[PDB]
Ligand binder design. Structure first.
Ligand SMILES: *[C@@H]1O[C@H](CO[C@H]2O[C@@H](C)[C@@H](O)[C@@H](O)[C@@H]2O)[C@@H](O[C@@H]2O[C@H](CO)[C@@H](O[C@@H]3O[C@H](CO[C@H]4O[C@H](CO)[C@@H](O)[C@H](O)[C@@H]4O)[C@@H](O)[C@H](O[C@H]4O[C@H](CO)[C@@H](O)[C@H](O)[C@@H]4O)[C@@H]3O)[C@H](O)[C@H]2NC(C)=O)[C@H](O[C@H]2O[C@@H](C)[C@@H](O)[C@@H](O)[C@@H]2O)[C@H]1NC(C)=O
Ligand SMILES: *[C@@H]1O[C@H](CO)[C@@H](O[C@@H]2O[C@H](CO)[C@@H](O[C@@H]3O[C@H](CO[C@H]4O[C@H](CO)[C@@H](O)[C@H](O)[C@@H]4O)[C@@H](O)[C@H](O[C@H]4O[C@H](CO)[C@@H](O)[C@H](O)[C@@H]4O)[C@@H]3O)[C@H](O)[C@H]2NC(C)=O)[C@H](O)[C@H]1NC(C)=O
Ligand SMILES: *[C@@H]1O[C@H](CO)[C@@H](O[C@@H]2O[C@H](CO)[C@@H](O[C@@H]3O[C@H](CO[C@H]4O[C@H](CO)[C@@H](O)[C@H](O)[C@@H]4O)[C@@H](O)[C@H](O[C@H]4O[C@H](CO)[C@@H](O)[C@H](O)[C@@H]4O)[C@@H]3O)[C@H](O)[C@H]2NC(C)=O)[C@H](O)[C@H]1NC(C)=O
Ligand SMILES: *[C@@H]1O[C@H](CO)[C@@H](O[C@@H]2O[C@H](CO)[C@@H](O[C@@H]3O[C@H](CO[C@H]4O[C@H](CO)[C@@H](O)[C@H](O)[C@@H]4O)[C@@H](O)[C@H](O[C@H]4O[C@H](CO)[C@@H](O)[C@H](O)[C@@H]4O)[C@@H]3O)[C@H](O)[C@H]2NC(C)=O)[C@H](O)[C@H]1NC(C)=O
Ligand SMILES: *[C@@H]1O[C@H](CO)[C@@H](O[C@@H]2O[C@H](CO)[C@@H](O[C@@H]3O[C@H](CO)[C@@H](O)[C@H](O)[C@@H]3O)[C@H](O)[C@H]2NC(C)=O)[C@H](O)[C@H]1NC(C)=O
Ligand SMILES: *[C@@H]1O[C@H](CO[C@H]2O[C@@H](C)[C@@H](O)[C@@H](O)[C@@H]2O)[C@@H](O[C@@H]2O[C@H](CO)[C@@H](O)[C@H](O)[C@H]2NC(C)=O)[C@H](O)[C@H]1NC(C)=O
Ligand SMILES: *[C@@H]1O[C@H](CO)[C@@H](O)[C@H](O)[C@H]1NC(C)=O
Lengths: 430, 137
């Protein structure tokens, strides 16, 4: 039959394929921009920001935020949800096929969203509130949490999560869905959350082991403790964690809210869970004093325990007290979410689109690295390109490793701000 | 699009004009460095971004969080601004054409006065910065 084709997508996994696993001076990534998936706006004042992309099982979920003269997620009037497929166009490269687009019913009240693609359908997990400051002055009983879901054929169904029926592993006043994406394992969804707590319940052994210059008049222990405080409300602590949701045909929910391991805690920031290489990877942005890449495969669920990479090369920009490559404990806040995708276990390899600058947010470079060194890199643009967030996913397309990355870009100064999508290939030869 | 002359945050700097403060006219794409200088004597500062109302009243609201906290005299501490939409800053810290931004510190300069919310070197020694972006004189 002439209608049939074998699937060109596979999860990057199994016995390693052949590609460049060592240093290279001028790698060929076959870098191509994909400009047809993300909408274009007639009003140059509309800002499209905070892109999120999850690729799983050949299908993808895209999300972004639209706001007027504001790139802040909180000022967003509309939040866009997109479902699609990864396809072979005969291009000798993977293609994004956009099946569906809808705006979130509750867009004006949306605090935060995380995508997950599961069983070929798109699911979006949202935290909705009548109060923009809800994470500072309020609690989770005052807000609502939804799963919107849809696919190519179906119209979106958005269902409310019975948070009333949840069980938490600690006493949290508040939590938000925060990050680049979640995963589904069996009947369970697992979504990255940032939780809020009123009491300092935390230990920092790691932070306390450092010896270097600290703010005079303050003990190291004081600093390590106070560094987990919301800089907006000092009575609250922000701790990353996960929400596990069980479901049967989107009915009969069982929900657990767990906090992340207390081993090397970092101030609550957007994270990600992704399926790779037969494992599950957790990434956390570095928004506090430790500016090196924070990521690891998940060795234990309860408590949620990624085995933290010890990475001496990859970092992020921030301005002021904790710029790039700053490893000394301080009370400081900032950074950029730039997540990573694993390439090969045996060689301990990862791609990420990272910002090459000490302070400014700019110069995305596709970087392939191990814990110790950067194997190879390429700038995304030959011109200065102002970019904040970046996400990357990787897979096998026609039995070779391929990546797609979304970049939160401001190309034309301050106007027509729109994110850029890119596909690129991991070099077969060095 | 170029690098503006650096601004050292300290009493010694002439560029703060009494009763006025430092006033700048950067254009989108430009860079500026604000530096907390390292060391016999030392000034302790927490440098903040505020709106006009607060810059005039020389006050900081409790929710605000600083660009710079210079409590560490042995090391240089730098905040590099490029005026553009996107920064790694948690608040979002955006720079748009035809808008004004104020940078003040209410602090005594003494370690005991580093957390002081009202008055401080903003009120006395006129340490204030006004940045009018995409604008000129
Ligand atoms: C956290 O780190 C800090 C600072 O970082 C240190 O890291 C190590 C890895 C080294 O690189 C070190 O050089 C760094 O300073 C550390 O605090 C400092 O510790 C160092 C020692 O590790 C110490 O340096 C010493 O200073 C001596 C001063 O002597 C003076 O007097 C003589 C004549 O009497 C004169 O000639 C000197 O010029 C001085 O004026 C000096 O004699 C030492 O020099 C020898 O050792 C070096 C290093 O091997 C060698 O190359 C030379 O040839 C010499 O043979 C030595 O360098 C420095 O003074 C400390 N800073 C202070 C005290 O402010 C912390 O460790 C320290 O903590 C306390 C308890 C202190 O009393 C030190 O004994 C102790 O090591 C460290 N924290 C912890 C918990 O380890
Ligand atoms: C992170 O990734 C880096 C880069 O991929 C890894 O570092 C490399 O490790 C390999 C071994 O696994 C090293 O290979 C070595 O090459 C030597 C010759 O190069 C020397 O000269 C260069 C200058 O160009 C120096 O920079 C370098 O340090 C070396 O001193 C040889 O002596 C060895 O090669 C042997 O093995 C090969 C097979 O691999 C045989 O065919 C040869 O005949 C020979 O027997 C030596 O193995 C390589 O130099 C390293 N590069 C670095 C350090 O930059 C890290 O291992 C990896 N990190 C982690 C934690 O995995
Ligand atoms: C920094 O973070 C702290 C800690 O979370 C926040 O303090 C909380 O503020 C909220 C509201 O702003 C409080 O919620 C209220 O709780 C009342 C009973 O609990 C306590 O209230 C006092 C307040 O000081 C405590 O000292 C005392 O221990 C009580 O146990 C409720 O009765 C309130 O009801 C509200 O909702 C109903 C509708 O359901 C309305 O009809 C009411 O009018 C009212 O609005 C309310 O839910 C919370 O208890 C505070 N926790 C504390 C103080 O520990 C700060 O707000 C935050 N600061 C900033 C600047 O964001
Ligand atoms: C980043 O860096 C950290 C810090 O070193 C690494 O953490 C270490 O990782 C190694 C390897 O995973 C761990 O070593 C293993 O320890 C097992 C026993 O663990 C004890 O450790 C605690 C101390 O906190 C004890 O109190 C407790 O009772 C545990 O019993 C050993 O049984 C293991 O043996 C393994 O190796 C042999 C090789 O001969 C095999 O034959 C065995 O079958 C088995 O596989 C192993 O040696 C070590 O505990 C960790 N130290 C910590 C956490 O402080 C991170 O792994 C590193 N990150 C990455 C990504 O590599
Ligand atoms: C995505 O697909 C997977 C598998 O294709 C779905 O997993 C399925 O989850 C249901 C729960 O809704 C499982 O049913 C349960 O089975 C146990 C027996 O182990 C039974 O005791 C329970 O009462 C319950 O009925 C089902 O077994 C499982 N399927 C497989 C193959 O393991 C998952 O639900 C899908 N996610 C969606 C549609 O969002
Ligand atoms: C957010 O608030 C709405 C009510 O306020 C809505 O209407 C306007 C006043 C405007 O502010 C609009 O933006 C806003 O969404 C809540 O709906 C209602 O909540 C009350 C609470 O007692 C119920 O009694 C009502 O039945 C309910 N209206 C319905 C169900 O149609 C909404 O629940 C709230 N959401 C959250 C997450 O707090
Ligand atoms: C499960 O979902 C299917 C999808 O159409 C539906 O037909 C069926 O009635 C649902 N059953 C239950 C028990 O939820």
């Amino acid at each position: 039959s002439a209608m049939y084709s074998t699937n060109a997508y596979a999860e990057l996994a199994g016995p390693p394929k052949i590609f460049c696993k060592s240093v290279s001076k001028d790698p060929d990534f076959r870098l191509k921009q994909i400009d047809y998936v993300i909408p274009v706006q007639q009003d140059r004042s509309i800002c499209m920001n905070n892109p999120l992309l999850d690729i799983s099982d050949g299908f993808f979920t895209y999300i972004h935020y639209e706001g007027i003269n504001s790139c802040k997620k909180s000022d967003s009037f509309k939040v866009l949800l997109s479902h699609g497929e990864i396809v072979d166009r005969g291009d000798y490269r993977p293609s994004l096929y956009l099946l569906s687009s809808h705006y979130h019913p509750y867009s004006m009240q949306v605090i935060n969203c995380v995508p997950v693609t599961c069983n070929q359908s798109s699911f979006v997990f949202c935290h909705i509130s009548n109060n923009t400051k809800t994470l500072d002055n309020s609690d989770y009983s005052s807000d609502e949490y939804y799963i919107t879901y849809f696919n190519g054929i179906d119209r979106p169904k958005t269902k409310k999560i019975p948070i009333n029926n949840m069980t938490a592993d600690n006493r949290y006043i508040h939590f938000t869905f925060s990050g680049g994406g979640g995963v589904c394992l069996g009947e369970e969804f697992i979504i990255p959350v940032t939780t809020v707590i009123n009491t300092d319940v935390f230990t920092h052994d790691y932070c306390e082991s450092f010896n270097c210059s600290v703010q005079t008049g303050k003990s190291l222990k004081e600093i390590c403790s106070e560094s987990l405080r919301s800089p907006t409300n000092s009575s609250r602590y922000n701790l990353n964690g996960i929400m596990i949701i069980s479901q049967n045909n989107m009915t009969d929910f069982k929900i657990q809210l767990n906090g992340i391991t207390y081993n090397k805690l970092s101030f609550g920031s957007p994270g990600r869970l992704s399926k790779t290489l037969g494992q599950v990877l957790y990434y956390q942005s570095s928004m506090s004093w430790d500016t090196y890449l924070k990521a690891g495969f998940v060795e234990k669920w309860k408590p949620f325990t990624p085995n933290w990479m010890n990475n001496t090369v990859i970092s992020r920009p921030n301005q002021g007290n904790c710029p790039r490559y700053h490893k000394c404990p301080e009370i400081c806040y900032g950074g950029t979410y730039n997540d990573i995708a694993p390439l090969d276990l045996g060689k301990d390899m990862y791609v990420s689109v990272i910002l090459d600058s000490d302070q400014l947010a700019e110069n995305p470079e596709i970087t392939v690295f191990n814990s110790t060194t950067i194997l190879y890199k390429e700038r995304v643009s030959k011109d200065e390109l102002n970019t904040r967030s970046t996400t990357t996913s990787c897979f096998l397309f026609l039995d070779e490793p391929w990546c797609i990355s979304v970049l939160e870009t401001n190309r034309f100064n301050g106007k027509s701000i729109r994110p850029e999508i890119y596909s690129y290939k991991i070099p077969k030869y060095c | 699009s170029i690098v503006l002359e650096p601004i050292y945050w300290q009493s010694s700097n002439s560029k703060f004009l009494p009763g006025q403060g430092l006033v700048l006219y950067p254009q989108i794409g430009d860079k500026l460095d604000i530096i907390c200088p390292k060391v016999g004597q030392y000034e302790y500062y927490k440098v903040y971004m505020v709106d006009k109302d607060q810059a005039d009243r020389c006050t900081i609201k409790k929710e605000n969080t600083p660009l710079l906290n210079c409590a560490k005299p042995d090391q240089d501490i730098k905040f590099t601004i490029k005026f553009q939409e996107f920064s790694p800053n948690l608040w979002g810290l955006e720079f748009q054409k035809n808008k004004d931004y104020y940078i003040i510190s209410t602090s005594n300069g003494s370690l005991e006065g580093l957390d002081n919310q009202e008055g401080g070197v903003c009120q006395t020694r006129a340490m204030k910065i006004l940045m009018k972006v995409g604008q000129d004189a």
